[PDB]
């Protein structure tokens, strides 16, 4: 499976949702103060992103794709509004299931779900799939690989920022300024892979 392995690794290392395409940066840089907070948020992103991307692939191909419902009718201009609605819908559906049938799971994840209601990562992941014209199988691999890379990045940043309690950052860079520099250095490490020569 060289094609699938290359897609998984490329989406994680060279095309990471956070350090490469800068998706969810507002949430990535702010909530990364603590590892426990970031770890729970990362799992919530993984669940939504891994399910929403394949689902919107079906919705796009069944309706929004040209000549999907009626020949000669192209509803692809509704991609942006439809993706926002379905992403918001699926998030609310997850809240309904977790808060009612899995209270332990809702405590771990549901507290972060309002933050990722309109997060750029979830919308960005769906947008990239359609533009690159992925299949259903490639969408599942891309959806899982994109979500894992986002959680991996934010948890790694959270561990670094906790370690930086001993740092002596100048006052101008303290807080937001040094976080951008830290995330840029994390981008250098993640550029190790761009594919797999299986």
């Amino acid at each position: 499976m060289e094609h699938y392995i290359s897609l998984l690794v490329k989406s994680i290392f060279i095309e990471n949702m956070a350090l490469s395409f800068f998706l969810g940066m507002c949430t990535f840089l702010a909530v990364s103060k603590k590892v426990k907070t970031s770890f729970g948020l990362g799992i919530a992103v993984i669940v939504v992103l891994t399910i929403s991307v394949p689902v919107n692939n079906l919705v796009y191909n069944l309706v929004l794709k040209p000549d999907a419902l009626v020949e000669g009718v192209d509803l692809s201009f509704l991609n942006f509004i439809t993706f926002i609605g379905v992403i918001a819908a699926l998030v609310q559906i997850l809240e309904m299931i977790l808060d009612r049938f899995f209270p332990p799971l809702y405590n771990a994840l549901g507290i972060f779900l309002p933050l990722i209601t309109v997060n750029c990562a979830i919308f960005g992941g769906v947008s990239f799939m359609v533009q690159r014209d992925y299949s259903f199988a490639e969408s599942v691999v891309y959806g899982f690989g994109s979500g894992v890379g986002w959680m991996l990045a934010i948890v790694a940043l959270a561990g670094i920022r906790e370690k930086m309690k001993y740092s002596d950052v100048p006052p101008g860079l303290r807080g937001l300024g040094i976080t951008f520099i830290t995330a840029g250095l994390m981008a250098l490490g993640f550029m190790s892979f761009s594919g797999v020569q299986l």
Binding site: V155, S167, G189, F193
Partner: protein
């Protein structure tokens, strides 16, 4: 000397005319003589070890690699020059490059029968300008930050500068070396507060800057041998093309044996070629307790396991699958990074259990980038920088287990 330092001490103290240069004065005065300070509180006696001795032992530990590297860089250049040119054409080449005629002016020779003195002298002309530029430019940034923040210059730049100079091609332009060291010192180290307060390896961050900003001068077949007009691939590149049978030194026409790569008779970075020289230096600092043998053990475990797995799986298209673990050891910058760069205590994990996981990650990542990444023949710099990001994460896992034991009163 001692009397002069004491007399000028009042000039750099507060209220003197040279207060703004106090950082430079302490960097020089304490360099020659010990501070002569007594303890103020409990633990009225102290261990004899300090940061100065720790950094100077690592700095001395790379001298065997540095001297062999200058000898090897000259030997590779001289052999390739006589392979390409001869007679009047060789004379014109020597006159056209200042490295070549400076060697001949100082009593050396560029002929094929040059002794070890000429080869080491030619390597010196390529390494010393790089090391001088890195030291001066990096030192200026270190002093400037210390002066602005009104702190004494912490040690560690001597290690950073010499390690950066030994991991670059001998043909590297001086202006790129100044930019590379500037990125490593300022962006990776100084904006975090200096020595001991950064998370990323400063020397490899500077090399990563040159790796991606100017890839043409730090990769390919034109930068690893300092002979004008000579194009030659290295062992890692040749193995990726045609496996073990492709390891041929075109400068001499002889195959690259395992002993040649282990001793260091191969082209590459200045200070990486000799695995034997790196082992001798590493053994001294590992024995002294400065370098961590847990990290080094982890790197070997990761490299051995993953390389053996690739050999067992096998591949009929990728020749890197069949490279054994002992060939991985002697090729590229694996030995240099494992012994002197993976062992950076500030960038590594702080727990003994974390150090094993930290080392294994480096060894796995390095072999993985070598084999399944076609763009890069080596991945040691990328592997260590990648593992610097997860070094705090390994510590977090270890301490959470420790806290759980404490909350249970260690079994009461």
């Amino acid at each position: 000397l001692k009397k002069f330092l004491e007399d000028i001490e009042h000039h750099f103290e507060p209220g003197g005319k040279h207060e703004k240069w106090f950082a430079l004065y302490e960097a020089a005065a304490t360099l020659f003589y010990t501070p002569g300070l007594v303890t103020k509180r409990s633990s009225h006696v102290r261990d004899s070890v300090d940061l100065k001795r720790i950094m100077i032992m690592v700095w001395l530990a790379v001298f065997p690699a540095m001297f062999w590297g200058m000898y090897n860089a000259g030997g590779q250049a001289i052999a390739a020059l006589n392979h390409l040119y001869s007679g009047d054409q060789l004379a014109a080449i020597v006159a056209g490059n200042w490295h070549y005629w400076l060697t001949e002016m100082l009593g050396g020779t560029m002929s094929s029968d040059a002794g070890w003195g000429s080869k080491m002298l030619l390597g010196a002309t390529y390494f010393l300008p790089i090391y001088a530029t890195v030291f001066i430019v990096g030192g200026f940034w270190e002093v400037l930050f210390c002066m602005v923040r009104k702190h004494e210059v912490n040690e560690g730049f001597f290690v950073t500068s010499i390690l950066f100079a030994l991991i670059v091609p001998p043909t590297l332009p001086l202006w790129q070396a100044a930019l590379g060291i500037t990125f490593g010192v300022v962006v990776a180290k100084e904006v975090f507060g200096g020595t001991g307060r950064n998370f990323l390896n400063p020397a490899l961050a500077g090399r990563a800057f040159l790796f991606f900003a100017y890839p043409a001068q730090i990769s390919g077949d034109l930068v690893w041998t300092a002979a004008d007009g000579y194009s030659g691939a290295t062992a890692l590149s040749q193995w990726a093309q045609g496996g073990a049978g492709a390891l041929i030194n075109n400068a001499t026409g002889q195959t690259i044996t395992w002993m040649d790569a282990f001793i260091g008779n191969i082209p590459g970075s200045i200070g990486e070629v000799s695995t034997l020289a790196l082992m001798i230096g590493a053994a001294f600092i590992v024995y002294m307790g400065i370098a961590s043998w847990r990290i080094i053990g982890g790197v070997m475990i990761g490299m051995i396991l993953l390389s053996t797995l690739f050999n067992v799986i096998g591949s009929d298209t990728n020749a890197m699958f069949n490279m054994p673990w002992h060939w991985h050891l002697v090729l590229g910058g694996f030995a240099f990074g494992m012994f002197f760069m993976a062992t950076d205590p500030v960038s590594a994990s702080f727990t003994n259990s974390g150090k094993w996981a930290y080392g294994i990650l480096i060894g796995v990542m390095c072999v993985l980038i070598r084999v399944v990444n076609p763009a890069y023949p080596e991945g040691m710099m990328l592997a260590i920088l990648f593992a610097n990001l997860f070094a705090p994460l390994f510590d977090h896992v270890v301490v959470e287990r420790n806290i759980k034991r404490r909350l249970a009163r260690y079994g009461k």
